[PDB]
Paper text:
Sodium and aspartate symporter [name] is an archaeal homolog of human glutamate transporters, which clear the neurotransmitter glutamate from the synaptic cleft following rounds of neurotransmission. Briefly, the transporters are homotrimers with each protomer consisting of a centrally located scaffold or trimerization domain and a peripheral transport domain that harbors the L-aspartate (L-asp) and three sodium (Na+) ions binding sites. The crucial conformational transition from the outward-facing state (OFS), in which L-asp binding site is near the extracellular solution, into the inward-facing state (IFS), from which the substrate is released into the cytoplasm, involves a rigid-body ‘elevator-like’ movement of the transport domain by ca 15 Å across the lipid membrane. Here, we report a series of Cryo-EM structures of [name] reconstituted into nanodiscs in the IFS and OFS.
In the GltPhIFS-[name]-[name] structure, [name]-[name] density was well resolved, and we modeled the inhibitor in its binding site. However, [name]-[name] assumes a different rotomer, leading to a displacement of the backbone carboxylate and the loss of coordination by the highly conserved N401. The aromatic rings of [name]-[name] protrude from the ligand-binding site and lodge in between the transport and scaffold domains. Most strikingly, HP2 takes a wide-open conformation that is essentially the same as in the outward-facing [name]-[name] complex. However, the bulk of the transport domain swung out away from HP2 and the scaffold to different extents with the largest angle between the transport domain and the membrane normal of ~ 47° in GltPhIFS-[name]-[name]. A consequence of these differences is that the bulky residues in the HP2 N-terminal arm, L339, L343, L347, and I350 make more extensive interactions with the scaffold TMs 4a and 4 c in GltPhIFS-Na and GltPhIFS-[name]-[name] compared to other structures. In GltPhIFS-[name]-[name] and GltPhIFS-Apo-open structures, the transport domain leans away from the scaffold far enough to open a window between the two domains that connects the interior of the bilayer to the solvent-filled crevice on the cytoplasmic side of the transporter. We observe excess densities in the opening, suggesting that lipids enter the space at a position structurally symmetric to LipidOut (LipidWindow). In an extreme case of GltPhIFS-[name]-[name] structure, the membrane bends outward, particularly when viewed from the cytoplasmic side. It is unclear whether the nanodisc restricts how far the transport domains swing in the GltPhIFS-[name]-[name] structure.
Author numbering:
A (entry chain B), B (entry chain A), C (entry chain C): 4 to 416
Write the structure that this text describes.
């Protein structure tokens, strides 16, 4: 038990994935699939329930504290320019991922049905009726139901009001707003501690999900996930080439001479799989150019937490894979809802220890595909089974997206 | 932007109403109504959504803090007599407004249908089953749904318990109740700051609502709102005459000699449209009679915030206009629910900057006519279009209702 | 009024029961039953609504504070052994009560229908799908609905995280978790103050419930409640004999010589009807054996609040009486849900002044039989009418269950 807890959790969940896939494949080939479905699948359904539990208090409390922490006069002009750049590039990354998932059609041809029936889709409202459904009718009724976008707006609009209250001239209202912000900060840190136990449970439920799904389907899923990782990587290299080379050549920096210097810390992201564990390495390559200290001392720790581009592209491709494996058809209107949710999920869940799972949970909730439906969990398990090589490429772009961002700011200043 | 914010908000929303009505009328006459319905109406639906958002946390937090602030031994006998008088006169004002809205039948003959279908009414429970539905089955489930009356009771019953906790002999429970009351006070003041931004947005959404509705209907609405303002003003003068002259002649004060002295500050309410901006003016006329300082130094600032009579009558007439324009039929049982909600809305939302809109929102929620249904918003926009002259008469009675109230207390003491 | 409040509340509600039963019987015999059903029953429906109101914030706030208060290193090994013993014996008591309620079939043959239709049962999920429904999908949506078991888990898992937060090394997170725990403690004590007013209202609503039910049915209910109290008492003596004599003879203590010393304070529980008002009496009989001071100074005040065995058996018999009078059929899966809820209700609602009513309300909510359905309230009133003699026997076993528990711990240590 204690020897199992002290193991590092990322290699733990990776070796759980690897031990799950092969064992599920041989149990699916030998014919013991029904025993797996009756005895192992509740250990994975418990894990997807524990993952759906944590997504609602985090997206309220963390967003309230984060919106209360900002100050546009204290945060300099360099800060607001790099925030504009990060949100614009993340929106373009989700748009390009949706484009490269419509061009490839991954998952089309599975016809997944777990219980014996297909996933019945919900009627999507028109385009105008969703931007009016951003603002909640009832702010308690948006938290009592799922409603990720009607509670992000309420959390941000509460945090800005708490900021306007905290610097007021009266004393009792300052004490009251201070105690309210401290209570919501306590709820946020309690959620951050529950996440660090659910992630310890994760290398059992993930093994259960893979050993269920690969025993159910088995053979065709490796072709479908090969098409998935091809549609991720060609759009990922197209993301780097198009977006970063245009945004570097429009400001006069030679992109080949930039990237041939940046490669020394770009390549360690491909083998480290952590955009924060390579921060002292990329500090050296930010020092290697002519960037002043007051820019790269501040921007790259912000870019390692807010600026996530490859994760933003993968959150479009792996949310079209679910809808194309479930037989649903995502119309326009809930197609830009993926963009508006994947940008604000990166700006919201900054610094959570479980960002990679709840950042997809709150997009699949916002589309209308909840993870408790048994058709969604199977395709989600296929995505988590292929997730390792995609995480390699995701970190590879997630580190480059900051070195191409501080150079633009150092060019204008 | 900054020049638009620094404008005073009441003249802003009034000139938005006036610029909305004429422009909507000429667009409705020239035949460009469908372009208005497809391009301008979301700016009004956004505003009615922003108005329905704010009504649930205010009616909980403000009521909790207000019920926690009272003390029946610190508040003197003069205070409890004037609270009994204010609530009795407000209940009689809602009853007389319901009478003068049944006698005139305003809005009967419109047959409003926006989407292409009429408003389907809900089955009203009997009389006994509503007074048992005052107390909530689930206090969290009353806030997660609308349920204005099952959350007013819970907020008051929580505030009284916090008052009984704060003066306890143990120390940890006193610290705990103090931090809880400070957190709910912080939520209340954060809602009061969000109201002051939604009211800044209001002179665009109000213009959108009027430019939609007057372009849809156009001609017959001026006759319907003329019947509405006639049914307001004849019941308003009957309110003054019957209620105030009987309650003044029963205690021996000559009402003609009283009102001929009170006219000097009664008439400025007709041209000021603010029952709080005429408080130093009516302090002079309270001084002009033989009222001692210890009564009129305290009562008139309480009467300008709690005692609202013309607003209570208008919240009966303009809630029968909605039900008679929508084809519904308000039975008895949800007819005294309007009385019990309009009294406790005046006692609850005391000091909010958005009292005039949420005080009608939480009555239309309590009847069963929510403002997100597109049939309700059109007739609500007709009421807001006629609202200016009614606000003049409402302030005219709202100021007189305190000068007739302190004289009774000065007569018994 | 003041002379009515200063009366002690337990003798008040008992004399309300006794004055209710006879008066309801003679009104049912003389033929004035419809006047009772139309004029008295809302006073009982108001009371069952006030009892259903209080069960949701208590089971969240009290559980959060109680789970935050524990420390397994500060609480000694004697403490964790006696907690294991108390929870094991309470689970065995609920199991034996369910056995002695299946063996007797109480309430089978009533065919109760108040409104004119029977109680429609809900479809029970299978056994695996309930242990996965323990963990909530949405922690706010578990509190917005009833969902007692999906909010007990969330309250415990929040309290443990607040405990792990409070001893952290950073200072701001310690301040934040301290203010959050103080706010939830304030909510818990506010609920404990509202309970002490609802219990003051209780000797009117209880009289209304009995005077309604005994006027409706009248004659056959005395045979049904005689079978109920027989099925309670034979299982209660079988509980004492089997469980306590096996758990005493397995550790070498002579049970006859133990109970002949323990009788001097066991017999006062039969006439006192209070397991806490006999605590100084049973301290003497704990001193009368060879128990050291460091065990019985700590354990018996814990056993009078956590260890409830006869109440645990009665919460199985009086929850099979409701399901057998309503025509429903409790399957296995919602039969061990009664065990898992009645154990955790004893561990949760420890120290509340209204434990005996909400501890059954949160079991009938967890089965799927809410107390607002008019078929459930009649059989619940039959249980409350017979409740006095059952409370005598319940206290008789509830006191013995601690004297048989400290002796085992004094034997191992
Ligand atoms: C606007 C976004 C840029 C403003 C700074 C910011 O986004 O703060 C972030 C907090 O979350 C938010 O800003 C949400 C507010 C949305 C503003 C629109 C986290 O940045 P961090 O430096 O990693 O600190 C982590 C502590 N939670
Ligand atoms: C089985 C059902 C699983 C339920 C998961 C509930 C998560 C519990 C939340 C609170 C527990 C917690 O925060 O501590 C966490 C420990 O959680 C656990 O070990 C319980 C998980 C047991 C099964 C794991 C396999 C670790 O947090 P930390 O910050 O790394 O602290 C290390 C020592 N100070
Ligand atoms: C009973 C009503 C009279 C007791 C005093 C009172 O109503 O306080 C009001 C607070 O709200 C309440 O009283 C709700 C409690 C209902 C008591 C029944 C506001 O009066 P204010 O002088 O304008 O102070 C504004 C600060 N929120
Ligand atoms: C477009 C969607 C509209 C959303 C309205 C959300 C309301 C934001 C709530 C927080 C903003 C706030 O409280 O400040 C308020 C400013 O709000 C705004 O200006 C934003 C509204 C922009 C569109 C208005 C036309 C003013 O409050 P104050 O007490 O008068 O302070 C004056 C300077 N200290
Ligand atoms: C494990 C249960 C034993 C740990 C101690 C305990 O249960 O505390 C109880 C508090 O409630 C809880 O423990 C719930 C936590 C469940 C732990 C599993 C009450 O015991 P008390 O001595 O009567 O104090 C009353 C103050 N609320
Ligand atoms: C009729 C509807 C009944 C509604 C019950 C609402 C309960 C009110 C909750 C707050 C009242 C409260 O806590 O005080 C309680 C008083 O409650 C009442 O007397 C109101 C009940 C009136 C009808 C009773 C027959 C007593 O608490 P305490 O700890 O014994 O303090 C004694 C003097 N310090
Ligand atoms: N690739 C980036 C970067 O590792 O820095 C990017 O970072 C986001 C990030 C940061 C810290 C933790 C996480 N969480 C995970 O990796 C994760 C992975 C799998 C699960 C699972 F339990 F399997 F669902 C849960 C969480 C994600 C990413 O992984 O998408
Ligand atoms: N007539 C009284 C007195 O002005 O003092 C009485 O005061 C209540 C009062 C006080 C302060 C602000 C408000 N709010 C408004 O006037 C208001 C008017 C229109 C809207 C709109 F946005 F159009 F819905 C919103 C709010 C109301 C009343 O207006 O009904
Ligand atoms: N018999 C035990 C012991 O009296 O100590 C055991 O104690 C639990 C306990 C302790 C303190 C108060 C309570 N509450 C009640 O007795 C009670 C009885 C009836 C009602 C009613 F209002 F009639 F529903 C409400 C509450 C229960 C029990 O009564 O079940």
């Amino acid at each position: 038990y204690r020897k199992y807890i002290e193991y590092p959790v990322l290699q733990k969940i990776l070796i759980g994935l690897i031990l799950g896939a092969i064992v599920g494949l041989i149990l699916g080939h030998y014919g013991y699939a029904h025993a797996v479905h009756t005895y192992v699948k509740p250990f994975g359904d418990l894990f997807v329930r524990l993952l759906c539990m944590l997504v609602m208090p985090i997206v309220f409390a963390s967003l309230v504290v984060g919106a209360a922490s900002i100050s546009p006069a204290r945060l300099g002009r360099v800060g607001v320019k790099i925030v504009v750049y990060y949100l614009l590039t993340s929106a373009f990354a989700v748009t390009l991922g949706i484009i490269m998932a419509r061009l490839f059609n991954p998952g089309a041809g599975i016809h997944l049905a777990v219980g014996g029936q297909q996933f019945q889709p919900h009627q999507a409202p028109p385009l105008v009726h969703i931007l009016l459904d951003i603002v909640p009718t009832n702010p308690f009724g948006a938290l009592a139901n799922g409603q990720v976008l009607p509670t992000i707006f309420f959390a941000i609009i509460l945090g800005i009001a708490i900021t306007y209250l905290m610097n007021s001239e009266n004393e009792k209202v300052r004490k009251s707003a201070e105690t309210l912000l401290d209570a919501i900060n306590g709820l946020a840190e309690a959620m951050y501690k529950i996440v660090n136990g659910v992630m310890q449970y994760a290398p059992i439920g993930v093994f259960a999900l893979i050993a269920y799904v690969m025993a159910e389907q088995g053979v065709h899923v490796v072709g479908e996930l090969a098409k998935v990782t091809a549609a991720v990587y060609v759009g990922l290299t197209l993301q780097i080439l198009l977006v970063y080379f245009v945004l570097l050549k429009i400001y006069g920096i030679d992109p080949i001479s930039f990237i041939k210097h940046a490669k020394d810390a770009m390549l360690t992201a491909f083998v480290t799989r952590s955009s924060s564990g390579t921060l002292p390495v990329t500090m050296r390559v930010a020092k290697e150019m002519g960037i002043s200290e007051g820019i790269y001392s501040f921007t790259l720790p912000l870019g390692a937490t807010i600026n996530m581009d490859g994760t933003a592209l993968y959150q479009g491709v792996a949310t079209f894979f679910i809808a194309n494996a479930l037989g649903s058809h995502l119309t326009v209107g809930q197609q830009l809802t993926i963009v508006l949710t994947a940008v604000l999920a990166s700006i919201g869940t900054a610094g959570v220890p479980g960002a990679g799972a709840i950042m997809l949970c709150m997009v699949l909730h916002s589309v209308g595909l909840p993870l408790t439906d048994p058709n969604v969990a199977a395709a989600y398990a296929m995505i988590l089974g292929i997730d390792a090589i995609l995480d390699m490429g995701r970190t590879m772009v997630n580190v480059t997206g900051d070195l191409t961002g501080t150079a633009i700011v150092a060019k204008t200043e």
